[PDB]
Nucleic acid binder design. Structure first.
Ligand SMILES: Nc1ccn([C@@H]2CS[C@H](COP(=O)(O)OP(=O)(O)OP(=O)(O)O)O2)c(=O)n1
Ligand SMILES: [Ca+2]
Ligand code: NA
Ligand code: NA
Ligand code: NA
Ligand code: NA
Length: 326
DNA sequence: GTCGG
DNA sequence: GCTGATGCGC
DNA sequence: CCGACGGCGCATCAGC
């Protein structure tokens, strides 16, 4: 990708604007608008000289163009400069860095005078369980996970899963599966022969239990029959520095919808929107669970059989790409 | 905010 | 007690 | 002008 010093000040402007829309203004769509604008501009292989130059790019409209002009002329953006010094909105934007605190909780806390982590720390009674864990691991959750540690984590997951029941299948997806050199967290996909569309008990629970029993999983954000979100930690040696606590999700999926899942939660997700927009073009409908053919109304028929990842490149006649190229 | 019926 | 809406992460 | 913009599981709130 192009270097930061081409339009980095712009791309950071747009991203900061993105966050205020999301966290303070509660305008999710303007947030994606700004993020879209920031993406296309980060992938632009040229140093932008005017707002009109930017506006040819798809996702950049009149208002972002004129923002780019003011920033190119002056180095800053008046509106952003203002929002940054604003105690209320500043804090609201900040508190959402806590996992479990979204725009609404954040606003509600700042209302009551709870503005900082110290204030949250002082008021444990007003946070839910997810929120206490997000606060407890605030720094660890912003740290990235080098591949070396994700491979040690992968080892522990595969070993313990196979130990519970040899017939479980577990693939680790996300950035890690696309060969990424670091990762934000660990997404694991799980199936079992005795779990399909028509359907045996506790398949997700026994796995989560074994990973607690050997102290890999240290806390639970949420858990149901289908999905687990929690916290985990690699053990360190005697006298060795403690490893940060890390986020791990585990999704239990039916056998037959498993490879559509693999694909979806592999991402990248900007390849995915690309892939189904092009699967609709060639007359197929894809989502996270299945591929189905449209009868051009378009009337999706039954979901088609899928036993590998590659099948969903056969149906679309798209030339296969493995995860690294995504 | 931006795109497109 | 229950169902449905909303917040959240993603 | 003006609606679409990702959709889904789980925790927890609102309401009956
Ligand atoms: N709008 C979207 C959003 C996500 N997706 C899917 C589901 S999750 C997968 C991307 O996974 P993550 O959000 O964990 O991100 P990454 O896999 O890149 O790793 P980290 O960022 O390191 O954590 O893409 C999609 O098809 N469309
Ligand atoms: Ca991930
Ligand atoms: Na944000
Ligand atoms: Na444009
Ligand atoms: Na948050
Ligand atoms: Na994710």
């Amino acid at each position: 990708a192009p270097q930061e010093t081409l339009n980095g000040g712009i791309t950071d402007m747009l991203t900061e604007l993105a966050n205020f829309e999301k966290n303070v203004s509660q305008a999710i769509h303007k947030y994606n608008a700004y993020r879209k604008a920031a993406s296309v501009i980060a992938k632009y292989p040229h140093k932008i000289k005017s707002g009109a130059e930017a506006k040819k790019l798809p996702g950049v409209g009149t208002k972002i163009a004129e923002k780019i002009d003011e920033f190119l002329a002056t180095g800053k953006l008046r509106k952003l400069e203002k929002i940054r010094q604003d105690d209320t909105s500043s804090s609201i934007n900040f508190l959402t860095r806590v996992s479990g605190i979204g725009p609404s909780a954040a606003r509600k806390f700042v209302d009551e005078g709870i503005k900082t982590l110290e204030d949250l720390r002082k008021n444990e009674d007003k946070l839910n369980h997810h929120q206490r864990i997000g606060l407890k691991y605030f720094g660890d959750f912003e740290k990235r996970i080098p591949r070396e540690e994700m491979l040690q984590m992968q080892d522990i997951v595969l070993n313990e899963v196979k130990k519970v029941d040899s017939e479980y299948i577990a693939t680790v997806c996300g950035s890690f599966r696309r060969g990424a050199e670091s990762s934000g967290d660990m997404d694991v996909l799980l199936t079992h022969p005795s779990f399909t569309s028509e359907s045996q008990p506790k398949l997700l629970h026994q796995v989560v239990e074994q990973l607690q029993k050997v102290h890999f999983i240290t806390d639970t954000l949420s858990k149901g029959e289908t999905k687990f979100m929690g916290v985990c930690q690699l053990p360190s040696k005697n006298d060795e520095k403690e490893y940060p606590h890390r986020r791990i999700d585990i999704r239990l999926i039916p056998k037959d919808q498993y490879y559509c899942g693999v694909l979806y939660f592999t991402g990248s997700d900007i390849f995915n929107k690309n892939m189904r927009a092009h699967a609709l073009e060639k007359g197929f409908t894809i989502n996270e669970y299945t591929i189905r053919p449209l009868g051009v109304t378009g009337v999706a028929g039954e979901p088609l059989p899928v036993d590998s990842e590659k099948d969903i490149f056969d149906y679309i006649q798209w030339k296969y790409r493995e995860p690294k190229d995504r």
